[PDB]
């Protein structure tokens, strides 16, 4: 019985691996060998955002490419205006321990969560001038690692209960559950078309889930350790993950196989945050060594290094327009980086 | 562009209000010591947090209590709403002033698991600078278990026979030498784990808990006070 199912699962794993090998004909490294190299890009810190009393654990940019929201372990959600380095809202949190932070595409909401296992959605455009907890989504049996808004009313949250959840904010229930991950789901990236989303967990696997159907289409396993960061390619047919294994890896959804493995012998620290550039040519990865690396997503070359943080780099996000990359670290600081011609 | 100037002035006023509130929050925050309760289910960690809540004013995810001892604020939290995977959510406690590690010294079967847990907490990359207040608990049941019952400790730790009570044992006046030997042995196992690595960065404060609650509060207070003394002396350089 159980032995037969185990053997059948092993046979299916072997068949999937054989199909992936059959698709592997010319690696992305050889395909991009002749392309002109990205060059030595250098980003200077235009604006350092200060005001947090504890370590920044997450941040997320707004669609406006100007307003961001950052979560600190002191129990504070601060919305920053990068253009003027001013704080618009400093929401106190009921639970000090916050590990995820979301900004709605419309700018009318923010979301936070963490060891309280609760997704708190805060309304910003309230009748009064005070930002209040619009809704406290509950139901997760583990710490909330990532929150990503979809359409102002539905939110996808990845948790430490090894499951992700699509919530209806108005009702407050689980519209959909996404099960299958064996470890803690830590990173979450929505597709630009909102139909699909990829989740990186602590089982060294990244799973592509269908939002409206609620099942896992694809499972990608190339990492030797737990994935901390995930980011969709702007095209929507690829995604990059970073692990505590000191590697980032690029996977394609249409080949069901990894394309390139950005790694170096000097890098021993794990990757915490990962995001692409506007065109996907640059892959920005935050590390535990208090540093960030900008790789060529097609060449696996360290195009640049962002070094301004005294503690672990916890989050980094690239604006919607690609204007700047904002990196928040455990030194209670967020730095906005941009390149000068 | 008068409207733009007005909007900028309003933004600056809101920012000033936010900074003032943030300074008040920092006033409350840096004067509060956040202790992290860590232990197994057998250990009376929940009992400890309940007793500390009932003694002072006090205040399912995380069980959090806030209390005042000698006008010094403490914030003790036990993480009980998670799974066994703690390699990711322990990272949230790298700024914690002290980890109160409660151990059940009476149960020898899981004492090795407690030692492993203490070792992993001690040798973490994100807990290298966090001092641990050891809380050997259930001392009365340890006394009852070593006075009689023939539940030998050497079955689980075959170094008990090759172990002598330390000269600096300062035990209770009525303690049987056997119970002093056992309690020490456990304390020295944890202390060997502590002094194996990271002695300079952080230190362990053994305490034989399950005594009167006031003694536990007082030991936590004194341990926290030095910890702050070490930190401030490292910052000043008089170390």
């Amino acid at each position, epitope marked *: 019985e159980l032995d037969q199912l185990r053997q059948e699962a092993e046979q299916l*794993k072997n068949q999937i691996r054989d199909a992936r090998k059959a698709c592997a004909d010319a690696t992305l490294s050889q395909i991009t060998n002749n392309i002109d190299p990205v060059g030595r890009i250098q980003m200077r810190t235009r604006r350092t955002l200060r005001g947090h009393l504890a370590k920044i654990y997450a941040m997320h940019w707004g669609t406006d490419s100007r307003l961001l929201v950052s979560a600190s372990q002191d129990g504070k959600l601060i919305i920053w205006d990068s253009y003027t380095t001013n704080k618009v809202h400093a929401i106190p949190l009921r639970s000090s321990w916050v590990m995820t932070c979301a900004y709605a595409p419309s700018g009318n909401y923010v979301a936070c969560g963490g060891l309280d296992n609760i997704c708190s959605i805060y309304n910003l455009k309230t009748r009064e001038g005070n930002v209040r907890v619009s809704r406290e989504l509950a139901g997760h049996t583990g710490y909330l690692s990532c929150c990503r808004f979809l359409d102002d009313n539905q939110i996808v949250t990845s948790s430490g209960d*090894t499951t992700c959840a699509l919530w209806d904010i108005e009702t407050g229930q689980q519209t959909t559950t996404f099960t299958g991950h*064996t*470890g803690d789901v830590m990173s979450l990236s929505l597709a630009p078309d909102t139909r699909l989303f990829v989740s990186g967990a*602590c*089982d*060294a696997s990244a799973k592509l889930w269908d939002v409206r159907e609620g099942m896992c289409r694809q499972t990608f*396993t*190339g990492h*030797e*350790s*737990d994935i901390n960061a995930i980011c969709f390619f702007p095209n929507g047919n690829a995604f990059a993950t970073g692990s*505590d*294994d*000191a590697t980032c890896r690029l996977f394609d959804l249409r080949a069901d196989q990894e394309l390139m493995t950005y790694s170096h012998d000097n890098i*021993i620290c*794990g990757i915490t945050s990962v995001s692409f550039s506007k065109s996907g040519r640059l892959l920005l990865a935050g590390y535990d060594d208090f540093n960030c690396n900008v790789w060529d997503a097609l060449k696996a070359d360290r195009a640049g290094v962002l070094a301004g943080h005294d503690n672990r780099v916890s989050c980094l996000g690239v604006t919607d327009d690609g204007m700047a990359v904002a990196t928040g670290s455990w030194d209670s600081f967020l730095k906005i980086w941009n390149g000068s011609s | 562009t008068e409207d733009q100037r007005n909007e900028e002035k309003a933004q600056r006023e809101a920012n000033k209000k936010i900074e003032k509130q943030l300074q008040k929050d920092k006033q409350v925050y840096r004067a509060t010591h956040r202790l992290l309760l860590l232990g197994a289910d057998n250990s009376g960690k929940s009992t400890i947090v309940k007793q500390m809540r009932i003694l002072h004013g006090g205040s399912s995810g995380i069980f959090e209590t806030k209390f005042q001892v000698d006008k010094v604020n403490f914030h003790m939290f036990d993480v009980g709403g998670q*799974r*066994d*995977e*703690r*390699r990711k959510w*322990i990272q949230c406690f790298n700024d914690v002033t002290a980890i109160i590690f409660v151990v059940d010294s009476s149960d020898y079967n899981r004492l*090795q*698991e407690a030692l*492993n847990d203490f070792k*992993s*907490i001690w*040798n*973490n*990359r994100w807990l290298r600078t966090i001092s641990v207040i050891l809380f050997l608990n259930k001392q009365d049941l340890l006394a009852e278990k070593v006075l009689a019952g023939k539940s030998k400790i050497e*079955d*689980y*730790f*075959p*170094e008990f026979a090759r172990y002598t009570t330390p000269e600096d044992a300062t035990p209770e006046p009525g303690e049987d030498p056997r119970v002093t030997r056992a309690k020490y042995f456990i304390r020295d196992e944890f202390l060997r784990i502590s002094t194996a*690595s990271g002695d300079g960065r952080h230190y362990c404060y053994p305490h034989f808990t399950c005594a009167v609650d006031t003694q536990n509060v007082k030991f936590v207070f004194d341990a926290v006070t030095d910890i702050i003394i070490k930190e401030n002396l490292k910052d000043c350089g008089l170390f």
Partner: nanobody
Amino acid sequence: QVQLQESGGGLVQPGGSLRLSCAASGFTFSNYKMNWVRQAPGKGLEWVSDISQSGASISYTGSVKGRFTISRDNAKNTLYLQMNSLKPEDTAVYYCARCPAPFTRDCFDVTSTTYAYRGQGTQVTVSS
């Protein structure tokens, strides 16, 4: 994909010797500290032994100290545990649990109920 397929294990009379060999594939063996953990019937997962990245730091639980000797062959990407003078309290399922992160000395999620970097294990039944 990370795989840690254990081997060995069977019916052994008390006092006998075994050698469990865990073959590891999908990750660089040398960079990861490893640890043999056992689950006895009607009991939780208990850590038995651990090996550092090369072999400098080797530790055993007290109940198996001297009896078991654990070694690592990096070239073959295998981890062995040698059982000597078995006792009936050792009847358990043995798993080769890899420490979650490379290049470190703290291993947290080993011996957890659901750990992603251990194998199915082998059944060792020390009985007569």
